Amino acid sequence: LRLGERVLVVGQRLGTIRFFGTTNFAPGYWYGIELEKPHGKNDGSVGGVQYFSCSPRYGIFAPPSRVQRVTD
Amino acid sequence: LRLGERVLVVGQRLGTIRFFGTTNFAPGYWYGIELEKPHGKNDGSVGGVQYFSCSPRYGIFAPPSRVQRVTD
């Protein structure tokens, strides 16, 4: 890992669960989460299909394997 | 994990290494990274102390354990 190298940084963002269920963008069950900061990718909808509703950029979707309670 | 519950979502952000070295904010060696999106926490400095320089919010710092090459 040298200077200039493109990388991926692993981290956690705090948010609130606003949805859990199947979706159109992918198989499986997904949590829809509203972050505290504009670090998200959507407003609760994906490709026009709504799942939950929040301000643009604060919305995000993640599989159970990437969601954990703060108290854990 | 019910609706309304506050949680932590684990994810990865893409970025470029712009620094590696010791710092004032904490012991150990830290990578300073400039993300592609305003999802960071600083402009390359922390508490007035500069390490690298980038636009506000695109800068972030992370320990070796949380940084990985894209090709991995």
Q: After which residues is chain A broken (C to N over 2.5 A)?
A: none
Between A and B, how many CB-CB pairs are < 8 A? 124
**Cβ pair B33:A66 closer than 8 A:** no
Q: What is the CATH number of domain A1-72?
A: 2.30.30.190
Q: Which of A6, A8, A17 sits opposite B7 (nearest CB)?
A: A17
- Bridge partners (DSSP) of residue B24 are none
Q: What is the CA radius of gyration of chain A?
A: 14
**Phi, psi torsion values for B19, nearest 5 degrees:** -170, 150
- Site from B7, B42, B61 to mutate, A interface, most A CB atoms within 10 angstroms: B7
Tell me how the structure was determined.
Answer: X-ray
**A25 three-class SS:** coil
Contact, A32 vs A55, CB < 8 A? no
**Contact predicate A70/B8, CB 8 Å:** yes
Largest separation between any pair of C-alpha atoms in chain A:
42
* Three-class SS state of B65: helix
Domain boundaries defined on chain B: 1-72
Report the alpha-carbon angle B1-B3-B9, nearest 5. Answer: 60
Query: CA–CA separation, B59 vs B46, rounded Å?
Result: 10
CA A8 to chain centre: 17
